[PDB]
Amino acid sequence: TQQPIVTGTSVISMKYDNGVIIAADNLGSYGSLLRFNGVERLIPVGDNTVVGISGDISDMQHIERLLKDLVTENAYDNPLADAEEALEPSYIFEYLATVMYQRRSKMNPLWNAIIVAGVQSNGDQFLRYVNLLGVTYSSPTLATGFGAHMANPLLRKVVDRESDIPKTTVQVAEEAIVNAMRVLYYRDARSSRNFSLAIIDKNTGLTFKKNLQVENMKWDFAKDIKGYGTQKI
Amino acid sequence: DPSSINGGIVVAMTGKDCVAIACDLRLGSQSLGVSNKFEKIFHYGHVFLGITGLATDVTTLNEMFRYKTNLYKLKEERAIEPETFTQLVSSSLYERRFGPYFVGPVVAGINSKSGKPFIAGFDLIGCIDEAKDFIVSGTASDQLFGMCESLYEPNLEPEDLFETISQALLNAADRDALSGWGAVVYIIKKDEVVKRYLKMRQD
Amino acid sequence: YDRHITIFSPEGRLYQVEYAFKATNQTNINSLAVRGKDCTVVISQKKVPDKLLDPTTVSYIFCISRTIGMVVNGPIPDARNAALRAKAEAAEFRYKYGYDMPCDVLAKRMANLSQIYTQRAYMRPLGVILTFVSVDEELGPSIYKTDPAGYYVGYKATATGPKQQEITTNLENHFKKSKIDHINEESWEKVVEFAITHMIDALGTEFSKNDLEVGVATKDKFFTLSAENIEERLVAIAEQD
Amino acid sequence: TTIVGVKFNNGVVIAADTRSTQGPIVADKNCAKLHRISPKIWCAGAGTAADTEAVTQLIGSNIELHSLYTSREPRVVSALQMLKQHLFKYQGHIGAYLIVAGVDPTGSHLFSIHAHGSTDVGYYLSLGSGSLAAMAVLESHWKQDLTKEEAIKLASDAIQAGIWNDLGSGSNVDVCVMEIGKDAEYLRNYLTPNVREEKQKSYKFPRGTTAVLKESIVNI
Amino acid sequence: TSIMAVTFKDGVILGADSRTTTGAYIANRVTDKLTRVHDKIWCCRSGSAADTQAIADIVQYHLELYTSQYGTPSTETAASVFKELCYENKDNLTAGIIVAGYDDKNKGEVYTIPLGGSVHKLPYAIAGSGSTFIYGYCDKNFRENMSKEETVDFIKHSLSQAIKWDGSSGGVIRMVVLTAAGVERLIFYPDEYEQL
Amino acid sequence: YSFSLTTFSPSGKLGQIDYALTAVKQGVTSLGIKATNGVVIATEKKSSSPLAMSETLSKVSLLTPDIGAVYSGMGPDYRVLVDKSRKVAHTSYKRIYGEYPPTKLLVSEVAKIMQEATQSGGVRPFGVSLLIAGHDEFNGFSLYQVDPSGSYFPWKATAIGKGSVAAKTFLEKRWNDELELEDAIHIALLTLKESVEGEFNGDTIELAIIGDENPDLLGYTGIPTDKGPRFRKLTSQEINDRLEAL
Amino acid sequence: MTSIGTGYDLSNSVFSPDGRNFQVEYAVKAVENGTTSIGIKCNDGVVFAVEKLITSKLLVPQKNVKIQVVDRHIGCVYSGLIPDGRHLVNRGREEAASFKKLYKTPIPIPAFADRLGQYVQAHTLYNSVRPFGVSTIFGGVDKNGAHLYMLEPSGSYWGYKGAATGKGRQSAKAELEKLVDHHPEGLSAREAVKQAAKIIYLAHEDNKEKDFELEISWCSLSETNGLHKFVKGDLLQEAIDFAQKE
Ligand SMILES: [Mg+2]
Ligand SMILES: [Mg+2]
Ligand SMILES: [Mg+2]
Ligand SMILES: [Mg+2]
Ligand SMILES: [Mg+2]
């Protein structure tokens, strides 16, 4: 892709004591037109991974298909495909990272930023980022695009350093995530009020929540804001 | 543009049982005149070809056409006719549609079988100017159009055609910085061809 | 070499092609194709002795295009190779030329592919005879048949199989008597009935709805019959009360 | 250039002006813009003159082979698909713009085609620099169910509009009439409304007017 | 261009304006942007006319081949084929295509494929230069499961308004109706739709 | 199979070409006769079933408007050569010069095609001989035979296939250099009548002439310089006509 | 029969004078030496079972899996030269993926059957390869229901109610036939599983000298949601116990 057409904004995510949380709104924009509103940008791979994608939606759909194909292929002649020899988040990540860097290097990027979230077989949280340049990093929180600028600073107040992770519960992390989603709705002109959230827990497995709405907003004070300086009424 | 680096002109005209074709002698590099003897008119059997434009392509096309017509004569066991050669020139040019020779060829000749005078012109990618009074080409083509439309009349005797195509060429050339520096004129009939070198301004 | 690849024998013959013709009778079933006023009917025996088979998947008739049907005499895998190729040719033709491939044009095309296998050493002929039918937009009801020699021709009617001379002579006699080159019935059902009746006659056997398969070309489309419609046809020609 | 196409009750008519221009200069004052794809399929071109002529010949050749191969009369839709696919493959770089008209076993047809490979169909069409003037006439005087003579008149009036109003166009009208059930009828210089007036004098020079340096006989 | 397709209770209806322009010149005032790629699978075209004709042509070829080999293709499958061509050649196409079909199980379906080649299944879709002006109108007037007549009216009203505001739209309103009963072509003239 | 399948034997002969000729010698008779104002080519239409419609096949083929061909030997080899011959006439001649090739050069291209099958790896030679009748502006009417080897010779008249020995003999007696097309047609019929076992009418005989230009076969009027095609195939009716008043 | 086609059986794609390809029939002899495999079409699905010969106690039980999945919805089992079987399944996986990529819907079973068939018959076309030394039983669920097929070295394939191949195929076919006769109203998937175990058990009496292990898989609308799954755990043991009782 030489330039993006239909696009998804921020994907955001954080680790907590027993797993990871990831969220992304359900909008596919078309320039400044808020064109499509039921676009799922979180992609579960098996029971242990959720791949969240921002950027060009055509490229996102292409990646979705690559992932389903992995699942299919991995199962061939694999008696333990649902067990010991299932796909690990780390395998899904390494594959995508390989693909993104290859496409960057052929001057034909997949025009996306991607976060891969899950839990490894030994119970370890997995959270790692890759984008259209093939750039990769991990951190206790990750966010793409606009969310990197406003969600990260919010989320880091919860998990600021590695040691904060075991002190953090799903309940607390999920609240942090949702609040960040509300803040993005306030200040990102390409955000939607509707979003999906997924939790991947070493004990409870994958929990995929569709159709969340940003709630509990403050608009009250707006009645008192008049003019832009001197105007009194 | 490539078609005005070297300079030069060609004109052909029909007359009664004759055709004539003429060209200047200049080869220059922009403002610098270099060769005083660069003729632009060739022949393959009884078919004449004049070529204006980029000198290197003028030379290349000549060799290409001598090659093609020689093979034609061998295989066909007779020399190529002006009508057939005209199509050959067209398709040879078009074959290079997207990387063309920078030329403006002109064909003149008398069909050995009909005895009919024939001329044609081409753009740089082979489009054929089927016109049959006169054809002009080169850096003074405007001037030539003007001279021909003025001086020309149909069914001139060869002796009169000679004066007409001469004056058309000479006067067009003297209003063009990139043309002139000598000229040659061919008067072509069935049984005779006469080549003449004209006296002209040398500035 | 000359008994193994398509090169000339001293008698100027091609043995592998001749042997390829022998292959066409290996399925031991007969087909016939007949033209109506406004339809073309193709009929072929169907012998499914093994009771573990799904008879509904056993077929030597193929819908090549919306308008062209084909019936093959010969082993099913060479049969299905040809069917696939013709389907692809017919699609490419419509795409490139902007109209439906005529039946005789498809036949010629396949004939040419076939003649190539008789000239190039590394390819073997297909062991098949391909009967093509349609109601062509210009030529009307049409039957064109191709063989492993690359030969094809158009037909008033034709028959192919181990007992083809029987059926053929049965048809010639009828067409002599009748003084026209097709069956004068508008109903494709009557044309199908005709074909079943004359095949029953020529083979000295009766048929149940499972013993044959039927294709029908009309101006609009080529289609095959369910066992139920075939039964309905068999009833139409039943001579017992 | 001004080319038009006009369908009538029993066929189609195609027409063109006869001026070809090197820039603001007229190279050929009596050029021929009506090309034959096959005996009953004819086309008129605007755009790059070499591309228009070349692509005409390519498809004409192929249409002929197709026709010999299939033993069928060439169909206008075949010329259409072959041309548009070729032009599309070249992504606009073959600057051919054509009106293609014809009759074949399926009836009578009228299409336009642009350099990028898009095609239209209608009862009346125009292309080239003079197409707005021509189309103004067509839009004023077309009616369904034209006779041959009416479609000739209308198409000829449309070319005239371009000849008179479009600097890109001029000289004569050429028409081809393709009627169902008949030979195509090509009318070269159907109209010649632009003959040069007699010049005021002859510019024949007295013999010997031109100075010669040297002379010689050439041997063919 | 103003193109839309609307699922309804009995199947799907495609609609389009008939204007093709080059510059401010209306090169075709009676264009047919409603293009058939299989019996009850059609599409609406916007963008480069060369591109959309070339795409639809190749898609019709693929589905013809599909049919002779595999049987009747689904609406989804047709949308898949379009998508594959639009996405893979994104750097060299300007095509905004709505794919719309009928079948006995799903009844009507609509897939819009915007520039870039993504694909979106929707209960209805609008597209083309003129659609911008009718986003708000269509949102407020579309219901699921409308009757045929209610649906024709919705499209007539929708496209009439898009034609009113968009210079790149105009001419007649074309409609194609896909249901179990078959394929029906409708037309509405300026003097009808301009009064709504 | 990337090696020649036609190779030299110790006697220096090339077996596959000889065996190709044997196939030709086995084919249905066909013949050509050159007149002063035309050429005729003819063959028999043996229908390999009465249920077959022989009209749907054509043993005499138009190559260019002025050139046609007939054959003896393997039909499908012929059919394919016909397709190749028509194409090469456009690709190596008409698209360059805007003219159809003259007969002898088109014969020469077909000869090349056949020569190639006798040398290239993995292929047998073509099993046909062609007779080719044409006209061109600078050579007038001509008649050639091409053989599986790619050899070609010009004839005033000749026959090929099964009954060619007797036919060549018959033609030697009746031929002179002043036949008009009508004589040549008549003689061709009498000649074919010997070879013909079975039915002999306008429906089992194929016959074409290269003669005068037919403006009525052009398909359009208006270009007066445009020559009609010289090739014309005779109808069933036209052939029967001559047969009754034989 | 002449089982040995002397002079025509030395290379693939050669027709014998009676129109046979002996290499293909020889490839069949290798299939007949393989272990028994079967397929049973059931009411909303299909079941596969294979005999696995325990050649040595050194084999690790429940490893060396023979049944393979293609896409998510198709099972394949084959008898004969096992590596030829994997080769064919590899091809099927590409064909399936390629279909799913253009057309989005999973490859329908008859479509998948023909991809394998053309590929298998393509290997009877040239002497530069040999035919596949396997017969393959395969199928699954699509939009049109359950489908079961068997594909031979020739490329020949048909749909089946029940299919058997390999050493004990005659015995298995007989039980498959009784099964058909006895169930005009249909067979549940669970039932088919048990019945499949019984049949493999009976067929094993041909390889009675060696021990064996039973492998069973299915694809069923109600049992596996139309995905291919290996029959395991209690259901497996229940079928093993049932088979043994008979
Ligand atoms: Mg100039
Ligand atoms: Mg000067
Ligand atoms: Mg000076
Ligand atoms: Mg061969
Ligand atoms: Mg408007």
Supply the DSSP string of chain A, one letter for each residue.
Answer: --S-SEEE--EEEEEETTEEEEEEE--EEETTEEEES----EEEETTTEEEEEEEEHHHHHHHHHHHHHHHHHHHTT-TTTTTTTSPPHHHHHHHHHHHHHHHHHTT----EEEEEEEE-TTS-EEEEEEETT--EE--SEEE-HHHHHHHHHHHHTTS-SGGGSTT--HHHHHHHHHHHHHHHHHH-TT--SEEEEEEEETTTEEEEEEEEE--S---GGGGG--SSSS---
What total number of domains does chain E contain?
A: 1
Q: Do chains E and G touch (3 or more CB pairs under 8 A)?
A: yes
CB contact under 8 A, D118 and E31: no
Structure tokens at F19: 């065996």
Structure tokens at D51: 């591309």
Query: Can you list the domains of chain G with their CATH numbers?
Result: 1-246 (3.60.20.10)
Quick one: which of D12, D14, D27, D23 has its CA closest to D159?
A: D14
The crossing angle, in degrees rounded to 10, of helices D76-89 and D49-70 is 130
Ramachandran angles phi, psi of F120, nearest 5°: -65, 150
Question: Could you please report the per-residue DSSP string of E114-154?
Answer: -TTS--EE-SEEEESGGGGGGHHHHHHH--TT--HHHHHHH
CB contact under 8 A, B150 and D203: yes
Helix (H) or strand (E) holding C59: none
Using CB atoms within 10 Å of the CB of residue G145, give its burial: 0 to 12 exposed, 13 to 18 middle, 19+ buried: middle
The crossing angle, in degrees rounded to 10, of helices A89-105 and A57-75 is 130
Note down the domain range covering C3.
1-241
Q: Which residues of E touch C63 (CB under 8 A)?
A: 68
Note down the domain range covering A163.
1-233
Q: What residues of E act catalytically?
A: 1
CATH for A106: 3.60.20.10
CB contact under 8 A, D207 and B150: no
Find the E183 Cα to ligand 5 centroid distance in Å.
28
Which chains, if any, share at least 3 CB pairs under 8 A with chain B?
D, F
CA distance F25 to B193: 56
Quick one: which of D109, D11, D75, E51 has its CA closest to C100?
A: D75
Selected residues 72-101 of chain D with any CB under 8 Å from a CB in chain E? 81, 84-85, 87-88, 91-92
Structure tokens at G58: 């050194």
Q: Are strands F61-64 and F52-53 parallel, antiparallel or unpaired?
A: unpaired
| Distance from the E64 Cα atom to the nearest Cα atom in chain C, whole angstroms | 6
Find the C116 Cα to ligand 4 centroid distance in Å.
7
Find the G26 Cα to ligand 4 centroid distance in Å.
22
CB contact under 8 A, C78 and G121: yes
Structure tokens at A65: 């298909």
Q: What residues of D act catalytically?
A: 1
CATH for E132: 3.60.20.10
CA distance E112 to E135: 15
Find the C124 Cα to ligand 4 centroid distance in Å.
4
Q: Are strands A49-56 and A42-45 parallel, antiparallel or unpaired?
A: antiparallel
Of all residues in chain E, the one with the smallest CA distance to G106 is E77
Instruction: Report yes or no: D70 at the F interface, CB cutoff 8 Å.
Output: no
How many Cβ atoms are within 10 Å of G83's Cβ, its own excluded? 10
Helix (H, G, I), strand (E, B) or coil at E84: helix
Asked if G39 and G77 touch (Cβ cutoff 8 Å), the reply is: yes
Q: Which residues of G touch A75 (CB under 8 A)?
A: 69, 72
Find the B35 Cα to ligand 3 centroid distance in Å.
13
CA distance F26 to C13: 10
Q: What kind of fold does domain B1-203 have according to CATH? A: Glutamine Phosphoribosylpyrophosphate, subunit 1, domain 1 (3.60.20)
Structure tokens at D85: 């696919």
Asked if B169 and B9 touch (Cβ cutoff 8 Å), the reply is: yes
CB contact under 8 A, F138 and B78: yes
Selected residues 91-130 of chain G with any CB under 8 Å from a CB in chain A? 93, 97, 101
DSSP state of E181: T
CATH for D130: 3.60.20.10
**Which residues, 6 or more positions from F236, have their beta carbon under 8 angstroms from its beta carbon?**
F201, F202, F203
CATH for C19: 3.60.20.10
Instruction: Report yes or no: G77 at the A interface, CB cutoff 8 Å.
Output: no
Q: Are strands D184-191 and F220-221 parallel, antiparallel or unpaired?
A: parallel
Quick one: which of B121, B86, B87, B91 has its CA closest to B104?
A: B121
CA distance B14 to C74: 71
Ramachandran angles phi, psi of G193, nearest 5°: -55, -55
Structure tokens at B150: 């003025």
CB contact under 8 A, C150 and F76: yes
Structural resolution in Å: 2.5
* C interface with G, Cβ–Cβ below 8 Å: 3-4, 15-16, 19-26, 51-54, 56-58, 75-78, 80-81, 84, 122-125, 127
**Which residues, 6 or more positions from A155, have their beta carbon under 8 angstroms from its beta carbon?**
A12, A14, A141, A143, A176, A177, A180
Of all residues in chain G, the one with the smallest CA distance to A76 is G69
What total number of domains does chain A contain?
A: 1
For the F1-246 domain, the top CATH level (class) is alpha beta
Of all residues in chain B, the one with the smallest CA distance to D208 is B163
Quick one: which of C89, C62, C90, C60 has its CA closest to C75?
A: C60
Using CB atoms within 10 Å of the CB of residue F172, give its burial: 0 to 12 exposed, 13 to 18 middle, 19+ buried: exposed
Question: Could you please report the per-residue DSSP string of F150-166?
Answer: S-EEE-SEEEESTTHHH
Asked if E16 and E34 touch (Cβ cutoff 8 Å), the reply is: yes
What total number of domains does chain C contain?
A: 1
Candidates D87, D116, D122; nearest CB to E48: D116
**Which residues, 6 or more positions from D15, have their beta carbon under 8 angstroms from its beta carbon?**
D3, D4, D5, D6, D34, D44, D155, D156, D158, D159, D173, D174, D175, D176, D190
Candidates F105, F137, F138; nearest CB to B75: F105
Find the A34 Cα to ligand 4 centroid distance in Å.
63
Question: Angle CA(A121)–CA(A124)–CA(A128) in degrees, nearest 5?
Answer: 105
Beta bridge partners of F14: F8
Marked catalytic residue, from G6, G35, G105, G124: G35
Beta strands in B30-93 (DSSP E): 32-35, 41-44, 47-53
Ramachandran angles phi, psi of D93, nearest 5°: -65, -20
CB contact under 8 A, A72 and G72: yes
Q: Do chains B and D touch (3 or more CB pairs under 8 A)?
A: yes
CA distance G101 to G33: 38
Note down the domain range covering E94.
1-196
Using CB atoms within 10 Å of the CB of residue F244, give its burial: 0 to 12 exposed, 13 to 18 middle, 19+ buried: exposed
For residue B121, give the ligand nearest its CA.
Answer: 1
First to last CA, chain C: 62
Structure tokens at C63: 């819908």
Of all residues in chain F, the one with the smallest CA distance to C120 is F123
Q: Which residues surround ligand 4, an ion (CB under 5 A)?
A: C 6, 117, 123
Burial letters G60-71, b for 16+ CB under 10 A, else e = eeeeeebbbbbb
Structure tokens at F201: 């009418």
Instruction: Report yes or no: D120 at the F interface, CB cutoff 8 Å.
Output: no
Of all residues in chain F, the one with the smallest CA distance to D188 is F222
Q: Do chains G and D touch (3 or more CB pairs under 8 A)?
A: no
Q: Which residues of A touch G68 (CB under 8 A)?
A: 76-77
Using CB atoms within 10 Å of the CB of residue D220, give its burial: 0 to 12 exposed, 13 to 18 middle, 19+ buried: middle
**Which residues, 6 or more positions from D29, have their beta carbon under 8 angstroms from its beta carbon?**
B131, D18, D19, D170, D171
Candidates B78, B84, B113; nearest CB to F97: B84
Ramachandran angles phi, psi of F109, nearest 5°: -65, -40
Asked if E173 and E31 touch (Cβ cutoff 8 Å), the reply is: no
Helix (H, G, I), strand (E, B) or coil at F244: helix
CA distances from B154 to A4, B14, B196, F15 (A): 66, 7, 22, 67
How many Cβ atoms are within 10 Å of B8's Cβ, its own excluded? 33
| Distance from the E131 Cα atom to the nearest Cα atom in chain G, whole angstroms | 29
| Distance from the B88 Cα atom to the nearest Cα atom in chain F, whole angstroms | 5
Asked if C130 and C82 touch (Cβ cutoff 8 Å), the reply is: yes
CA distance G137 to G157: 10
Find the C68 Cα to ligand 5 centroid distance in Å.
45
Structure tokens at F28: 């249905």
The sign one gets for the Cα dihedral F169, F175, F180, F186 is negative
Question: Could you please report the per-residue DSSP string of D167-216?
Answer: TT--S-EEEEEEETTS-EEEEEEEE---PPPPPSS--PPPTT-S-EEEEE
Instruction: Report yes or no: F86 at the C interface, CB cutoff 8 Å.
Output: no
Helix (H) or strand (E) holding B70: helix B55-76
CA distance C38 to C136: 10
Q: Are strands G145-151 and G157-159 parallel, antiparallel or unpaired?
A: antiparallel
For residue B32, give the ligand nearest its CA.
Answer: 3
For residue E190, give the ligand nearest its CA.
Answer: 5
Q: Do chains F and B touch (3 or more CB pairs under 8 A)?
A: yes
Question: Angle CA(D199)–CA(D203)–CA(D209) in degrees, nearest 5?
Answer: 175
Q: Which residues of E touch C94 (CB under 8 A)?
A: 61, 64
CA distance F6 to F16: 5
Helix (H) or strand (E) holding E159: helix E148-165
Look up tokens 């006469």; give the residue: B194
Question: Angle CA(G154)–CA(G158)–CA(G160) in degrees, nearest 5?
Answer: 135
CA distance F202 to E106: 61
By what method was this entry solved?
A: X-ray
